[PDB]
Amino acid sequence: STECSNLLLQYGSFCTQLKRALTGIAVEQDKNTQEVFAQVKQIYKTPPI
Amino acid sequence: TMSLGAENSVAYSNNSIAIPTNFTISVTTEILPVSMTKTSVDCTMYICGDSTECSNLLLQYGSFCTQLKRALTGIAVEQDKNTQEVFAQVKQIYKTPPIKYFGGFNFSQILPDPSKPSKRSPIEDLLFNKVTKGLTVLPPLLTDEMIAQYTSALLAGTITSGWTFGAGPALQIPFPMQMAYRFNGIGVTQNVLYENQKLIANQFNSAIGKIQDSLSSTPSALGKLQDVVNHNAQALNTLVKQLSSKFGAISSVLNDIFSRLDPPEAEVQIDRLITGRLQSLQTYVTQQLIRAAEIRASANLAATKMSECVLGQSKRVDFCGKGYHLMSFPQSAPHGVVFLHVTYVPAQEKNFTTAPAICHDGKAHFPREGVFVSNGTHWFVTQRNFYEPQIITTDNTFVSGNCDVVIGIVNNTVYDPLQPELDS
Amino acid sequence: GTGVLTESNKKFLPFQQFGRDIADTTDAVRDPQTLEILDITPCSFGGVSVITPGTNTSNQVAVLYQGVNCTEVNVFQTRAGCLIGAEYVNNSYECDIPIGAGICASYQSIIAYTMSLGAENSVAYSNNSIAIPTNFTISVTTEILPVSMTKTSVDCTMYICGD
Amino acid sequence: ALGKLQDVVNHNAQALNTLVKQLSSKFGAISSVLNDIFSRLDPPEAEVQIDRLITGRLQSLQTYVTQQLIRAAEIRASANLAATKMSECVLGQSKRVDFCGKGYHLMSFPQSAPHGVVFLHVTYVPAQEKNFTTAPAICHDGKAHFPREGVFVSNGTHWFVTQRNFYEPQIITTDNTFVSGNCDVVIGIVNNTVYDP
Ligand SMILES: *[C@@H]1O[C@H](CO)[C@@H](O[C@@H]2O[C@H](CO)[C@@H](O)[C@H](O)[C@H]2NC(C)=O)[C@H](O)[C@H]1NC(C)=O
Ligand SMILES: *[C@@H]1O[C@H](CO)[C@@H](O[C@@H]2O[C@H](CO)[C@@H](O)[C@H](O)[C@H]2NC(C)=O)[C@H](O)[C@H]1NC(C)=O
Ligand SMILES: *[C@@H]1O[C@H](CO)[C@@H](O[C@@H]2O[C@H](CO)[C@@H](O)[C@H](O)[C@H]2NC(C)=O)[C@H](O)[C@H]1NC(C)=O
Ligand SMILES: *[C@@H]1O[C@H](CO)[C@@H](O[C@@H]2O[C@H](CO)[C@@H](O)[C@H](O)[C@H]2NC(C)=O)[C@H](O)[C@H]1NC(C)=O
Ligand SMILES: *[C@@H]1O[C@H](CO)[C@@H](O[C@@H]2O[C@H](CO)[C@@H](O)[C@H](O)[C@H]2NC(C)=O)[C@H](O)[C@H]1NC(C)=O
Ligand SMILES: *[C@@H]1O[C@H](CO)[C@@H](O[C@@H]2O[C@H](CO)[C@@H](O)[C@H](O)[C@H]2NC(C)=O)[C@H](O)[C@H]1NC(C)=O
Numbered sequence: 001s002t003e004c005s006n007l008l009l010q011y012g013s014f015c016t017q018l019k020r021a022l023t024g025i026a027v028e029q030d031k032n033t034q035e036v037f038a039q040v041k042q043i044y045k046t047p048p049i
Numbered sequence: 050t051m052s053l054g055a056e057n058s059v060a061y062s063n064n065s066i067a068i069p070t071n072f073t074i075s076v077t078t079e080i081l082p083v084s085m086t087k088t089s090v091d092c093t094m095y096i097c098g099d100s101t102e103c104s105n106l107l108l109q110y111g112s113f114c115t116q117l118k119r120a121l122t123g124i125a126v127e128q129d130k131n132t133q134e135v136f137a138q139v140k141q142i143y144k145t146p147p148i149k150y151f152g153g154f155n156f157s158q159i160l161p162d163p164s165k166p167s168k169r170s171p172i173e174d175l176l177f178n179k180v181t182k183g184l185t186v187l188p189p190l191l192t193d194e195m196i197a198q199y200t201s202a203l204l205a206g207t208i209t210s211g212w213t214f215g216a217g218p219a220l221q222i223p224f225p226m227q228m229a230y231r232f233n234g235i236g237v238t239q240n241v242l243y244e245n246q247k248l249i250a251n252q253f254n255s256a257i258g259k260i261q262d263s264l265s266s267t268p269s270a271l272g273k274l275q276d277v278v279n280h281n282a283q284a285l286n287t288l289v290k291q292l293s294s295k296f297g298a299i300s301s302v303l304n305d306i307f308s309r310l311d312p313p314e315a316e317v318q319i320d321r322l323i324t325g326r327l328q329s330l331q332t333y334v335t336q337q338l339i340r341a342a343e344i345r346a347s348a349n350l351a352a353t354k355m356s357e358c359v360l361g362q363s364k365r366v367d368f369c370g371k372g373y374h375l376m377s378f379p380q381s382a383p384h385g386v387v388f389l390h391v392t393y394v395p396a397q398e399k400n401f402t403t404a405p406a407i408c409h410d411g412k413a414h415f416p417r418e419g420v421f422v423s424n425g426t427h428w429f430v431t432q433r434n435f436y437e438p439q440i441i442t443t444d445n446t447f448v449s450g451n452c453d454v455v456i457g458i459v460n461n462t463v464y465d466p467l468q469p470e471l472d473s
Numbered sequence: 474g475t476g477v478l479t480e481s482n483k484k485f486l487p488f489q490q491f492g493r494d495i496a497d498t499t500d501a502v503r504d505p506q507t508l509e510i511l512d513i514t515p516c517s518f519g520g521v522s523v524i525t526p527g528t529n530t531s532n533q534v535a536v537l538y539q540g541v542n543c544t545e546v547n548v549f550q551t552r553a554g555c556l557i558g559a560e561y562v563n564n565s566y567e568c569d570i571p572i573g574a575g576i577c578a579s580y581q582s583i584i585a586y587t588m589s590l591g592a593e594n595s596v597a598y599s600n601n602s603i604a605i606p607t608n609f610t611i612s613v614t615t616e617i618l619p620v621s622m623t624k625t626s627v628d629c630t631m632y633i634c635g636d
Numbered sequence: 637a638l639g640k641l642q643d644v645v646n647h648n649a650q651a652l653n654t655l656v657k658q659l660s661s662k663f664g665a666i667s668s669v670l671n672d673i674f675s676r677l678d679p680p681e682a683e684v685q686i687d688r689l690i691t692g693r694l695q696s697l698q699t700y701v702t703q704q705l706i707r708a709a710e711i712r713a714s715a716n717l718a719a720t721k722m723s724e725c726v727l728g729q730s731k732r733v734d735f736c737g738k739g740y741h742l743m744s745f746p747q748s749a750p751h752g753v754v755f756l757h758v759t760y761v762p763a764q765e766k767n768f769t770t771a772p773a774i775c776h777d778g779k780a781h782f783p784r785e786g787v788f789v790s791n792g793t794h795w796f797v798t799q800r801n802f803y804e805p806q807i808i809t810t811d812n813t814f815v816s817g818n819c820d821v822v823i824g825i826v827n828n829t830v831y832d833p
């Protein structure tokens with residue numbers, strides 16, 4: 001609904017706040033995975049035997 | 050597709066060991082946020098400004114204003130508590146000797162500068178340079194000068210007294226002997242420190258200079274503290290921006306509502322503006338509480354690092370820098386602490402042929418503190434973290450059992466110190 | 474609105490009437506009768522904080538006006554604001570009531586002071602001397618840690634609507 | 637002394653008292669009593685007034701749940717810390733500085749408390765320190781001797797080796813020292829005899 005969006009614009013930057021918080025959580029999850037698993041900068045390999 | 054890293058196939062075999070023949074004194078930086086901006090919001094002035102009728106209507110909502118003020122007050126006292134926990138870990142203000150010679154070790158970049166009015170270190174001064182309506186910002190309880198004084202006291206204690214001041218009275222010890230104690234902590238004998246004292250001092254000075262250059266040359270080094278400042282400022286800006294939102298009313302200005310509409314509809318319009326502004330303020334307070342919890346966790350971690358890396362030597366892997374931890378130095382930073390972790394990194398490793406035990410006289414000998422290595426023709430025992438080959442004797446080995454049980458035992462002679470004495 | 478109308482150094486363009494700052498609040502205006510520019514500085518708001526000991530002990534209070542200079546309101550100027558009713562003492566004690574910017578208040582009348590960080594100790598460092606303990610103290614210290622809270626359940630229908 | 641636990645009890649009681657107090661708020665309606673609203677207005681406008689009350693009370697309840705969840709996260713972090721202290725200070729001896737009391741940690745005792753745990757940390761604090769003249773190594777027979785586990789001290793005329801955390805002087809022998817290199821490299825080496833058993 002275009003009229004609903006026009007009425008929704010009157011409420012300000014609530015939508016921007018919610019998107020920014022979700023973006024912060026989204027980058028935080030990748031940072032968490034990077035901190036836990038990427039603790040080595042060399043990819044070691046086991047011997048064949 | 051992102052590259053995880055360089056492939057490194059380690060040459061594992063059942064009888065070969067790699068022993069370091071050299072070391073690098075590496076100083077690394079760890080930046081931890083400690084406190085946030087202390088914000089106080091006047092609920093009446095934010096929601097209503099100066100309108101008396103708006104305040105009268107606002108009184109009907111009860112203790113929302115008290116809840117928001119109480120939550121912000123809790124966050125504000127929490128920030129001061131966080132700073133107090135991280136930096137005020139000593140009750141004695143220690144001072145360095147006037148003759149600042151510590152065995153070839155240079156601490157000019159981290160000790161306070163007498164020439165500067167702020168009494169800060171060159172590194173701390175660089176850190177401070179590199180970090181840049183009903184609403185008020187409260188000053189922190191501890192000023193930058195007092196936090197710098199606390200860091201100076203911690204540096205003086207950790208330089209002149211080692212880790213003794215953190216566990217009781219400060220006991221003076223020469224800095225090379227302290228560095229030898231720290232070498233013993235990571236399993237390297239003190240002779241390695243004493244013989245290479247000039248090289249270790251030069252490496253430490255070079256690393257400290259590299260740290261200052263690296264901080265001065267990288268814009269994104271101090272992003273973690275900057276983000277906190279940015280998050281606080283942006284949140285404050287957004288909260289004020291919410292005042293310019295109609296929230297589904299004819300106008301965002303209360304006076305326009307009083308002048309343009311009758312009181313039966315005016316009360317509805319002011320109610321809409323009040324609920325919108327109150328919801329904005331509640332959203333801001335909720336964000337502040339979540340960020341305060343995150344900063345409190347970071348401050349607790351910083352206090353743990355201050356206790357375990359600066360006031361003692363830590364055996365925890367990667368807690369106090371990459372490598373075997375030797376010592377740490379605290380530096381004050383805007384809303385945060387920077388730890389300079391001095392660690393020992395092994396380097397210039399060499400292959401050797403290794404065995405679990407030495408078979409001599411039908412007895413199995415095992416190293417008391419080291420490892421058996423062979424350069425190809427001769428067998429020696431050396432400490433695990435530095436290559437220092439020594440003759441296999443009965444003083445650095447112990448006997449447990451015969452040679453029939455241990456898998457991979459090799460035959461070699463074991464010298465007896467007592468044998469030439471009774472022989473002669 | 475309500476405000477203090479002062480002379481303005483802001484050079485308006487001839488078509489502009491009102492003025493806004495960074496925070497989108499009306500802070501400049503042009504009088505309709507006179508084509509001069511006037512700043513609308515908001516009336517001198519401040520947070521009034523009351524520093525008091527327990528009412529069991531005394532009824533004396535001190536007033537801190539946050540972010541207000543002392544000439545615009547036992548008067549002391551702090552970076553937090555103006556403190557009235559407390560007398561600055563050049564001595565340093567432990568912090569009893571935190572004021573801010575290194576200032577703390579205590580009751581002994583109400584005094585305000587710069588809090589001491591710690592007792593001053595100079596370590597006798599030299600390159601060939603060590604200090605060895607000859608005795609020990611077995612010290613038992615307390616650490617209090619919260620573990621759980623009160624478990625609360627709320628009847629949503631009864632709270633919102635009752636009967 | 638027990639301010640933290642009493643503080644938690646105070647926050648929970650204060651949050652409940654505030655939540656009860658919030659029922660006395662009109663929330664932009666004619667009355668804060670729902671029964672009055674029914675007894676006084678037709679359903680088209682009474683529905684609106686009851687709505688005003690319902691949205692205000694629901695906002696109050698969601699606010700209370702939000703602070704309860706934030707306090708739950710804080711208490712969960714404190715409880716995780718308490719479990720770590722119970723595991724590492726009570727069930728073992730910790731080398732972590734200031735984790736289990738001020739001083740060198742010996743052992744710890746747990747005590748139950750209302751909504752909490754009290755740890756009695758038994759620690760070792762050095763006291764009655766004394767100055768001594770110290771050296772990195774002892775030069776004997778052209779060889780450098782270093783302490784195996786202690787430190788070289790001198791009371792003015794005689795050299796001894798003692799453990800670092802307590803003064804117990806012992807004669808410098810080959811049993812408690814090790815030889816690495818000659819005397820030409822170590823900075824600050826002093827000349828003293830090394831006894832042979
Ligand atoms: C120890 O020996 C192994 C092999 O005996 C060395 O591993 C080789 O290193 C070269 C140089 O990069 C590689 O090209 C080979 O592919 C490696 N071989 C294996 C089987 O991994 C190893 O470099 C030696 N260690 C040191 C410190 O010299
Ligand atoms: C161990 O490594 C250090 C450097 O990490 C070496 O010191 C360098 O030695 C070369 C020549 O011997 C000099 O040109 C450099 O200036 C030295 N660097 C520093 C920082 O002093 C040292 O020689 C190495 N030792 C061994 C036994 O390999
Ligand atoms: C310790 O380090 C500082 C800084 O690295 C040294 O100060 C430098 O001294 C040289 C020669 O005197 C000057 O050319 C540099 O400009 C100085 N740098 C700075 C930042 O001031 C200092 O000489 C070193 N030694 C001692 C004993 O302090
Ligand atoms: C392994 O190390 C030992 C000792 O460092 C070496 O033995 C010495 O080698 C030198 C080199 O010619 C001789 O001059 C000495 O006489 C040897 N000493 C003894 C006691 O025999 C040995 O050569 C090394 N082996 C390898 C393969 O490098
Ligand atoms: C190490 O020495 C032992 C004994 O000195 C060797 O064991 C002997 O091995 C031979 C042939 O393998 C047998 O005939 C003997 O009966 C064994 N004697 C004993 C007492 O076990 C052993 O082989 C040697 N190992 C190496 C690698 O040379
Ligand atoms: C070890 O000796 C030093 C200096 O000989 C002592 O330090 C002095 O202590 C006195 C007494 O408090 C002070 O007045 C001096 O200012 C101190 N001098 C310095 C340079 O700090 C130290 O107290 C002695 N240690 C012990 C345990 O007696």
Ligand SMILES: *[C@@H]1O[C@H](CO)[C@@H](O[C@@H]2O[C@H](CO)[C@@H](O)[C@H](O)[C@H]2NC(C)=O)[C@H](O)[C@H]1NC(C)=O
Nearest residue numbers: 606607608609610611612761762763764765803
């Ligand atoms: C080490 O300190 C303890 C006290 O911490 C000393 O014990 C005291 O000794 C005196 C005289 O012998 C008694 O009057 C006290 O009652 C003792 N105190 C306690 C708590 O038992 C001990 O003598 C000190 N040792 C040394 C060598 O100085």
Ligand SMILES: *[C@@H]1O[C@H](CO)[C@@H](O[C@@H]2O[C@H](CO)[C@@H](O)[C@H](O)[C@H]2NC(C)=O)[C@H](O)[C@H]1NC(C)=O
Nearest residue numbers: 789790791792793794795796797804805806807
């Ligand atoms: C340093 O300590 C040693 C022993 O701990 C002292 O040597 C003894 O001193 C006593 C009394 O002075 C004599 O009766 C002994 O015969 C000495 N023993 C030896 C083996 O000589 C020494 O006097 C102390 N030095 C100082 C300056 O106090």
Ligand SMILES: *[C@@H]1O[C@H](CO)[C@@H](O[C@@H]2O[C@H](CO)[C@@H](O)[C@H](O)[C@H]2NC(C)=O)[C@H](O)[C@H]1NC(C)=O
Nearest residue numbers: 775776777778779818819820824825826827828
């Ligand atoms: C410790 O003893 C060594 C020798 O046992 C002394 O070294 C000699 O000192 C003299 C004069 O200083 C020189 O002429 C010799 O060439 C040195 N010999 C050696 C092998 O270095 C040393 O000076 C003594 N140190 C002290 C502090 O007494």
Ligand SMILES: *[C@@H]1O[C@H](CO)[C@@H](O)[C@H](O)[C@H]1NC(C)=O
Nearest residue numbers: 049062063064455456457458
């Ligand atoms: C080590 O490996 C080699 C070949 O991989 C084998 O011949 C030898 O017996 C092994 N030694 C031990 C002690 O396992």
Ligand SMILES: *[C@@H]1O[C@H](CO)[C@@H](O)[C@H](O)[C@H]1NC(C)=O
Nearest residue numbers: 503504505506507508509510
């Ligand atoms: C408006 O009235 C003021 C009042 O004295 C007068 O001075 C001015 O000339 C008038 N006209 C304009 C255009 O300002």
Ligand SMILES: *[C@@H]1O[C@H](CO)[C@@H](O)[C@H](O)[C@H]1NC(C)=O
Nearest residue numbers: 150152599600601823824825
């Ligand atoms: C200690 O300092 C003095 C003078 O500062 C010097 O003569 C002496 O050699 C130094 N000793 C050591 C071990 O550095």
